[PDB]
Design a protein around this ligand. Structure first.
Ligand code: NAG
Ligand code: NAG
Ligand code: NAG
Ligand code: NAG
Ligand code: NAG
Ligand code: NAG
Lengths: 90, 90, 90, 90, 90, 90
């Protein structure tokens, strides 16, 4: 049983996931040895991310703007009236 | 049983996740030895992130602006009226 | 049983997570030896993050602005009227 | 009389020049005004050089190696036995 | 009479020059005004050099290595036996 | 008579020059006004050099190594036996 990121063993579940990201190297798992070694061994890793990320955001005279939003709800027996990143203009 | 990030063993669950991030190297797990070693061994890792992240945010005369928001609710038997990152203009 | 970040063993749960971050190297777990070693061993790690993060935020004459918000509620049998990062303009 | 780099007025001369370089903008001379100006004037300049110059030099078991050398000599009436960047192997 | 770099007025001369360099902007000369100005004037300059110059030099088991050398001699009536960056191996 | 760097007025001369350098902006000369000005004037300059210059020098088991050397001699009537950056191995 090895789960790197989210779930390994569940009977019932539900999820929501988002990503605005930058990654070089993940997931170096299960490095296990059963036996014998005699002379030499070498392991090596190098990572480099996000070299000069240049970005500009401009918004003039807008009404509604939404960048990132994640909503997840579970109801067994009920009423739900929920909202997120909502904008009312009149 | 090894879960790196979120969940290893659950009977019932629900989650929401977001990321605005930068990462070089994660998840170096399960490095276990069962046996014998004689002469030499070397392990090595290097990480570098977020080299000169240049960014500007500008908003002039706006009405509603929403950058990042995460909402997750669970109800068994009830009424729920919730909100987040909401804006009312009149 | 080893859970690095959030949960290892739960019967029922629910969570919400957010990140605006920068990381070089995480998750070096399970480094356990069962056996014998004779001559030499070396382990090495280097991390570097957040090299000259330059950023500007400007907001002039706005009405509603929301950067980051996380809300998570659980109700068994009840009424809930909650809000966060809300703005009313009239 | 305006000489930017090497010589403006000479009766007798001799020179030697070398360059291993990188340059964006030179030689903005002779900006002189004779007259009148009334309302507005703008002058602007931007320069950027040497973006991530990556280079490696390797030499194994060599005998003679010469990278850069400049020699210039002037004699009126005489004997000259000069040398530079010379290598004798026996 | 304006000489930026080397020589403006000479009767007899001799020189040697070398460069391993990086430059953004030089030579903004002769900015002189003869007259009248009324309302506005702006002058502007920006320079940036040597962005992440990465370099390695390696030499193993060599005999003679010469990187940079400049020699210049002038003799009226005489004998000259000079040397520079020389290597004798026997 | 204005000489920025080396020589403005000489009857007889000789020189040698070298550079391993990095420069953003030089040579802002001759800014002289003859006349009248009424309302406004602005002069501006910005310079930035040597951003993360990373370099390594390695030499193992060498015989002769010469990086930088400059020699210049003048003799009217004589004998000269001079040397620089020389290496004798036997
Ligand atoms: C649910 O939310 C809405 C508004 O979005 C509201 O009008 C309603 O009364 C709430 N409940 C039900 C059962 O509609
Ligand atoms: C839920 O929230 C809404 C407003 O968004 C409100 O009008 C309502 O009365 C609340 N409850 C129900 C059952 O609608
Ligand atoms: C829930 O909140 C809303 C306002 O958002 C309010 O009008 C309402 O009375 C509250 N309760 C119910 C059952 O609606
Ligand atoms: C000049 O230099 C050489 C060696 O390069 C030497 O043999 C000689 O004697 C010197 N002078 C003359 C006149 O040759
Ligand atoms: C000049 O230098 C050389 C060695 O390079 C030497 O043998 C010689 O005697 C010197 N003078 C003359 C006239 O050769
Ligand atoms: C000049 O230097 C050389 C050695 O480089 C030497 O042998 C010589 O005697 C000196 N003078 C003359 C005239 O050669």
């Amino acid at each position: 049983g090895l789960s790197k990121a989210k779930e390994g063993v569940v009977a019932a579940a539900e999820k929501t996931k988002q990503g605005v990201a930058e990654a070089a190297g993940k997931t170096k798992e299960g490095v296990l040895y059963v036996g014998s070694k005699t002379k030499e061994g070498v392991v090596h890793g190098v990572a480099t991310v996000a070299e000069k990320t240049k970005e500009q955001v401009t918004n003039v005279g807008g009404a509604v703007v939404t960048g990132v939003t994640a909503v997840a709800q579970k109801t067994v027996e009920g009423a739900g009236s929920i909202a997120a990143a909502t904008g009312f203009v009149k």
